[PDB]
Design a protein around this ligand. Structure first.
Ligand SMILES: CCCCCCCCCCCCCCCCCC(=O)OC[C@H](COP(=O)([O-])OCC(O)COP(=O)([O-])OC[C@@H](COC(=O)CCCCCCCCCCCCCCCCC)OC(=O)CCCCCCCCCCCCCCCCC)OC(=O)CCCCCCCCCCCCCCCCC
Ligand code: BCL
Ligand code: BCL
Ligand code: BCL
Ligand SMILES: CC[C@H]1c2cc3[nH]c4c(c3C)C(=O)[C@H](C(=O)OC)c4c3nc(cc4[nH]c(cc(n2)[C@@H]1C)c(C(C)=O)c4C)[C@@H](C)[C@@H]3CCC(=O)OC/C=C(\C)CCC[C@H](C)CCC[C@H](C)CCCC(C)C
Ligand SMILES: CC[C@H]1c2cc3[nH]c4c(c3C)C(=O)[C@H](C(=O)OC)c4c3nc(cc4[nH]c(cc(n2)[C@@H]1C)c(C(C)=O)c4C)[C@@H](C)[C@@H]3CCC(=O)OC/C=C(\C)CCC[C@H](C)CCC[C@H](C)CCCC(C)C
Ligand SMILES: COC1=C(OC)C(=O)C(C/C=C(\C)CC/C=C(\C)CC/C=C(\C)CC/C=C(\C)CC/C=C(\C)CC/C=C(\C)CC/C=C(\C)CC/C=C(\C)CC/C=C(\C)CCC=C(C)C)=C(C)C1=O
Ligand SMILES: CCCCCCCCCCCCCCCC(=O)OC[C@H](COP(=O)(O)OCCN)OC(=O)CCCCCCC[C@H](Br)[C@@H](Br)CCCCCCCC
Ligand SMILES: CCCCCCCCCCCC[N+](C)(C)[O-]
Ligand SMILES: CCCCCCCCCCCC[N+](C)(C)[O-]
Ligand SMILES: CCCCCCCCCCCC[N+](C)(C)[O-]
Ligand SMILES: CCCCCCCCCCCC[N+](C)(C)[O-]
Ligand SMILES: CCCCCCCCCCCC[N+](C)(C)[O-]
Ligand SMILES: [Cl-]
Ligand SMILES: [Cl-]
Ligand SMILES: [Cl-]
Ligand SMILES: [Fe+3]
Ligand SMILES: [K+]
Lengths: 281, 302, 243
């Protein structure tokens, strides 16, 4: 079925591979070559997980868990039951994600829009690839990647963090958190401003972007403007993820001791190093 | 290359925009501040004007008295030496009164009293500021969505520093004012309540925090992607749908099989965000009042 | 639910399901009901119903907009099915750039200019915009405009600026015959010694839709111009040299 305004846009073209061979839709969904690639990778991905369940002996979605190769396998392969599946499912995962970004690029091409979305997505894929691929490779084993399970992955988050003490003290992770919270601040506000203009007090006319600037200037002395705020949310959120990737890519590799102790560089700087008083002398 | 529109290629400037008047008492708006070419590549160059009525004066004054109260404590913790101050700045902490003083104000200044003072000031600052968010909306005839949204943030803050300590019977349950100390507090809180990863409200909060990043990446990337048809002009696209709104919908319909409207994306937005601190503050409010250990609760409740 | 946490979490899930329901219906104020490819009301609309309509009061006497309501393209669509069953593309029946289809599509928005908070035209040429000037960056006024066939299509004669937001929205470009066209600023690349337009070859510039009045643009006209230039990425590609 089609949105009332949709037919005019459903023209041939834009595909990156296969010419017209897969230039079509199922329902609302554009297919294309990467639609086929995505389905194939997802499907195989899920079948292997569905199998991996069998070998664990569970079907509960809160129990099912596909564990990476034990740390002693290094960066080699493991049997299906003992790590192999995870390795193949990560290949399928990456394949499905990257295929979905490239489908997105195809839709953009057909719709005549900019490529900002699949670019944005590429940051999520890179975070994932840090956790399952770049970090493990730099450390020397697939065992360091997180396992695929609803709870078991949270188990992994906590163990991983507590290896380095209170993980809060990772300074890239501090920056990352700041971007997440600021992004959420920005999203609340943006949502709230547009709606407060679109839906003004009872009986009144819709307000105007000038109302939106005025509101924020009156309140905080500044307005970024409507191009600004969309640039901002994109920047905040992509930055949150870039620092998330960074804070892990360094942990276990350039830094592997307790993160709290890193801050000693500043404390011990030579001018104030040996001044008595304070918390640290 | 194709131009991405994250920064602008040319800046234009015109006479300072003094704003819409509606019902705003103009006696209380400053004049425009400077223009910043730097901000200009990304957003608006113009700074100011700002509205400062009495409620705003209160909020700022109170806000400043808070920062100060902490600062006094810190410089004192630093034996008045600025070298030590700068060196240890993240290690200083203004801590609440001991468990032994319960909810009383009986504690010495150096051992609880100052913390109460600071918290008093922050309470006045935030609440007065909340009212500003409503009143500035009102003066212009706009909806109160901002003030409602802000209330959800206020909620988590209020739970952490006031409601939960009141329900637990002591100020010692509140968070200290300090950069490292408040992180330690956060860690400690989870350790002591059976690991907050077991708190279903904590999990929701994360879903929403992550989702806000997902959503705003989506949304912002989308408006930028359709900015060649005037996408960012969302109110007029609300009032009179254009090819920008349609290509945006259809990107998503063809990707994931459903999609938004220009106004509706902003309702997904406000809620995605607001549910962060809502769910968050429930999670915490229940922690230690009704549930001492989330691992344990989990075992007995699915 | 003996315990208040259990009551809380169960209540929240119910709320979230209701919220998602409400949210999804709010997003069906446009483009619905779903239609078959022939334009008739489709059989399966999905499990979410159409919200109860709301009306916006538009400012500056411009009327109201009530949504959802009778959906209609209000223009003919030069495309034809390419298959005997649902879900395949629709071939343009003429020149899609001229016909306004595909990535060259436009919407029949209002044929008036967007007004600002004070009821003044939002976008005006910078000559007509008191006290507006280029404040930073390379000024494009005077640069030659080059299309993707590496051929000169014209020169830049003004920036059209958004007054209330103080930003550039279009470049006004003079063609060989002395008329002008607006090019979206988002689709040009101001280089040190030229403006480059990848979307269009020089021969396609004349075809950019014109504005009935030389010192304002209407929302309808914005859509046709922006539609047209975007269309070039697909439809001008046989004239797009490497670069
Ligand atoms: C534990 C479990 C928790 C459960 C509940 C959690 C929270 C619920 C909050 C509900 C708020 C509802 C507000 C409302 O009615 O507004 C109309 C609003 C219209 O918005 P608009 O048209 O743009 O505004 C027009 C006017 O300008 C109209 O007026 P305006 O300009 O002033 O603003 C309108 C509206 C627009 O604002 C928003 O909608 C944005 C939402 C942000 C609000 C966040 C609330 C913060 C509360 C913090 C306190 C924490 C307590 C936690 C406990 O804002 C409000 O009406 C909110 C009023 C706030 C009063 C709060 C006082 C408490 C102290 O529409 C809705 O909000 C609908 C929400 C639907 C909710 C889902 C219902 C599901 C129920 C379950 C059944 C499903 C069956 C499944 C089986
Ligand atoms: C005890 C635990 C430690 C701790 C240890 C760690 C560890 C360990 C890690 C983090 C990471 C993060 N932590 Mg920390 N952290 C702690 C305390 C905190 C606190 C807090 C308030 O205390 C906060 C706010 C954070 C915040 C964060 C973020 C900065 C970052 C997670 C987001 C991210 O990486 O997204 C990135 C996004 C993704 C990976 C999403 C990928 C999505 C992919 C591309 C798509 C998949 C699609 C899907 C399969 C499709 C499904 C089908 C459809 C739905 C139909 N931490 C405590 C102290 N933290 C992580 C990080 O930075 O990772 C890089 C990390 O590894
Ligand atoms: C980012 C840092 C850590 C991590 C830290 C945490 C922490 C900490 C928490 C979660 C939580 C969640 N994480 Mg995790 N998470 C990580 C990586 C991932 C990846 C991945 C492929 O990279 C995926 C798919 C998930 C998925 C999930 C969800 C099960 C749950 C809600 C997240 C959410 O709403 O996000 C935002 C996205 C949306 C709102 C869009 C919808 C996403 C849907 C819900 C994803 C469904 C996944 C599904 C159950 C598995 C499908 C696989 C199929 C075979 C296709 N996580 C890494 C290792 N994650 C929370 C939880 O409650 O866990 C029990 C929680 O507290
Ligand atoms: C070891 C640490 C524990 C842990 C302990 C805690 C504790 C304790 C809490 C959280 C909370 C949260 N944690 Mg946790 N958390 C852990 C692991 C994680 C991980 C992860 C990858 O491991 C992630 C992603 C998160 C993420 C989160 C968020 C979802 C949530 C905070 C939401 C928010 O926006 O707060 C930030 C928003 C605010 C604090 C609102 C404040 C608003 C006020 C009004 C602002 C006043 C400003 C003032 C005037 C000064 C400003 C000056 C101006 C700039 C001029 N946690 C581990 C398991 N976490 C919080 C929560 O909700 O839990 C349910 C919480 O209380
Ligand atoms: C970079 C900034 C943020 C971001 C951006 C972002 N994400 C995006 C996009 C963008 C711009 C999209 O365009 C795309 C989308 O379509 O959204 C609706 C996407 C997307 N982000 C998604 C999720 C997601 N994003 C997240 C995070 C973020 N994404 C950031 C915070 C997270 C987390 C954990 O925080 C999640 C869970 C999906 C909704 C969607 C991508 C859909 C996709 O790739 O579909 C193809 C794949 C499948 C349909 C299934 C694949 C099956 C696999 C082969 C097996 C599963 C393996 C998996 C590793 C197991 C995990 C188990 C868990 C318990 C851990
Ligand atoms: C809903 C979830 C998210 C959210 C939402 C949210 N926050 C909000 C709002 C909303 C909807 C607002 O309306 C409100 C706001 O005003 O935003 C602009 C706010 C707000 N969120 C804020 C912060 C904040 N929000 C956070 C979080 C979040 N907020 C969530 C992630 C966080 C954290 C910890 O993550 C922080 C730190 C503030 C920016 C603002 C509330 C302001 C406030 O209450 O201020 C009171 C204190 C003062 C007024 C004192 C400030 C002093 C200044 C430095 C000025 C200096 C004085 C003067 C200039 C002269 C002298 C100076 C010297 C040079 C001498
Ligand atoms: C203003 O503009 C904008 C719009 O429009 C006006 C928009 O809509 C949106 C989009 C945003 C929304 C609609 C809001 C709601 C979104 C969220 C809360 C974000 C999270 C979304 C999800 C969690 C749902 C994800 C669903 C997915 C990924 C699809 C599942 C897909 C399948 C089961 C099959 C898909 C197709 C495949 C595999 C290939 C082809 C199919 C074959 C069968 C072959 C934004 C951002 C926007 O800014
Ligand atoms: C925590 C949130 C903080 C937000 C607010 C920050 C507080 C900033 C306070 C600044 C003090 C303002 C001084 C004004 C008083 C003064 O003496 O100058 C007034 C004078 C004119 O008075 P007049 O008599 O003509 O007007 C009366 C009749 N109309 O105007 C001036 O000279 C200076 C105006 C300066 C305004 C600039 C404010 C910019 C703010 Br700080 C921006 Br740059 C920063 C906020 C960024 C966003 C923060 C929130 C992000 C989440
Ligand atoms: C019980 C307090 C509740 C609110 C939490 C306040 C703690 C956050 C303060 C961060 C540090 C600020 N400071 C004083 C170090 O600059
Ligand atoms: C948390 C996972 C949620 C996945 C959301 C998937 C919704 C897609 C619905 C597409 C509609 C397709 N169809 C045929 C029913 O119209
Ligand atoms: C990511 C999609 C989430 C959709 C939310 C739907 C929640 C359904 C909850 C229904 C209530 C269930 N129960 C057992 C608590 O009553
Ligand atoms: C298969 C999982 C799909 C997740 C999408 C969740 C849909 C929520 C639908 C809301 C239900 C309507 N209700 C009953 C609350 O009125
Ligand atoms: C956060 C979970 C994401 C919400 C997913 C629920 C929305 C499903 C919408 C499908 C309806 C599409 N339809 C039939 C109206 O075209
Ligand atoms: Cl005020
Ligand atoms: Cl709403
Ligand atoms: Cl005028
Ligand atoms: Fe927006
Ligand atoms: K001028």
């Amino acid at each position: 079925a089609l949105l009332s305004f949709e037919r005019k846009y459903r023209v041939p073209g834009g595909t990156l591979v296969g010419g017209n061979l897969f230039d079509f839709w199922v329902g609302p969904f554009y297919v294309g070559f990467f639609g086929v690639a995505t389905f194939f990778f997802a499907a195989l991905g899920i079948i292997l997980i569905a199998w991996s369940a069998v070998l664990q002996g569970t079907w509960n979605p809160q129990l099912i868990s596909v564990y990476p190769p034990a740390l002693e396998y290094g960066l080699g392969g493991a049997p299906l039951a003992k790590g192999g599946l995870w390795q193949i499912i990560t290949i399928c995962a990456t394949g499905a994600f990257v295929s979905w970004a490239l489908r997105e690029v195809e839709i953009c091409r057909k719709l005549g829009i900019g490529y900002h979305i699949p670019f944005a997505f590429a940051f999520a894929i890179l975070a994932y690839l840090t956790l399952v691929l770049f970090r493990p490779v730099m450390m020397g084993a697939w065992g360091y990647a997180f396992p695929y399970g609803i709870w078991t992955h949270l188990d992994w988050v906590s163990n991983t963090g507590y290896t380095y003490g209170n993980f809060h003290y990772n300074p890239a992770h501090m920056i990352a958190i700041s971007f997440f919270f600021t992004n959420a601040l920005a999203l609340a506000l943006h949502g709230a401003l547009v709606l407060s203009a679109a839906n003004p007090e009872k009986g009144k006319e819709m307000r105007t972007p000038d109302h939106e600037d005025t509101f924020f200037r009156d309140l905080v002395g500044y307005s970024i403007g409507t191009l600004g705020i969309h640039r901002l949310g994109l920047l905040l959120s992509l930055s949150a993820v870039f620092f998330s990737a960074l804070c892990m890519i360094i942990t276990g590799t350039i830094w592997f001791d307790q993160w709290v102790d890193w801050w000693q560089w500043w404390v011990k700087l030579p001018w104030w190093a040996n001044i008595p008083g304070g918390i640290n002398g | 290359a194709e131009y991405q529109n994250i920064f602008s290629q040319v800046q234009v400037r015109g006479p300072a925009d003094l704003g819409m008047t509606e019902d705003v008492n103009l006696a209380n708006r400053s004049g425009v501040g400077p223009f910043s070419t730097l901000l200009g590549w990304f957003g608006n160059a113009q700074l100011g004007p700002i509205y400062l009525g009495s409620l705003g004066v209160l909020s700022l004054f109170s806000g400043l008295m808070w920062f100060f109260t902490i600062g006094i404590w810190f410089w004192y913790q630093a034996g008045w030496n600025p070298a030590v101050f700068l060196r240890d700045l993240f290690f200083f902490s203004l801590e609440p009164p001991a468990p032994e003083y319960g909810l009383s104000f009986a504690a010495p200044l150096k051992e609880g009293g100052l913390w109460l003072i600071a918290s008093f000031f922050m309470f006045v600052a935030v609440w007065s500021w909340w009212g500003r968010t409503y009143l500035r909306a009102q003066a212009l005839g706009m909806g109160k969505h901002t003030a409602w949204a802000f209330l959800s943030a206020i909620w988590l803050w209020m739970v952490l520093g006031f409601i939960r300590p009141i329900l637990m019977g002591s100020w010692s349950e509140a968070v200290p004012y300090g950069i490292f100390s408040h992180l330690d507090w956060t860690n400690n809180f989870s350790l002591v309540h059976g690991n907050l990863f077991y708190n279903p409200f904590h999990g929701l909060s994360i879903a929403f925090l992550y989702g806000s990043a997902l959503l705003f990446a989506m949304h912002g990337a989308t408006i930028l992607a359709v900015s060649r048809f005037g996408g960012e002009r969302e109110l007029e696209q609300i009032a009179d749908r254009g090819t920008a709104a349609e290509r945006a919908a259809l990107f998503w319909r063809w990707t994931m099989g459903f999609n938004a409207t220009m106004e509706g994306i902003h309702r997904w937005a406000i809620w995605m965000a607001v549910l962060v601190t809502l769910t968050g503050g429930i999670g915490i409010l229940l922690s230690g009042t009704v549930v001492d250990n989330w691992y344990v609760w989990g075992q007995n409740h699915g | 639910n003996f315990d208040l946490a259990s009551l809380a979490i169960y209540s929240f899930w119910i709320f979230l399901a209701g919220l998602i329901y409400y949210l999804q219906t709010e997003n069906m104020r446009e483009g619905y009901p779903l239609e078959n490819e022939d334009g008739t009301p489709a059989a399966n609309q999905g499990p979410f119903p159409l919200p109860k309509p709301k009306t916006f009061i538009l400012p500056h006497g411009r009327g109201t907009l009530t949504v959802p309501g009778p959906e209609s393209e209000d223009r003919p669509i030069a495309l034809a099915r390419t298959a005997v069953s649902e879900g395949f593309p629709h071939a343009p029946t003429g020149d899609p750039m001229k016909d306004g289809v595909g990535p060259a599509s436009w919407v029949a928005r209002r044929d008036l200019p967007e007004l600002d908070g004070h009821g003044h035209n939002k976008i005006k040429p910078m000559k007509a915009a008191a006290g507006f000037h280029v404040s930073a960056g390379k000024n494009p006024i005077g640069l030659p405009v080059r299309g993707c066939d590496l051929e000169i299509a014209g020169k830049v004669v003004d920036i059209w600026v958004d007054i209330p937001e103080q930003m550039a929205r279009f470049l006004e470009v003079e063609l060989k015959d002395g008329s002008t066209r607006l090019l979206p600023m988002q689709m040009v690349k101001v280089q040190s010694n030229r403006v480059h337009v990848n979307a269009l070859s020089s021969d396609l510039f004349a075809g950019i839709p014109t504005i009935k009045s030389p010192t304002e643009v209407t929302l309808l006209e914005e859509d046709k111009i922006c539609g047209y230039v975007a269309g070039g990425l697909m439809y001008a590609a046989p004239k797009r040299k490497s670069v």
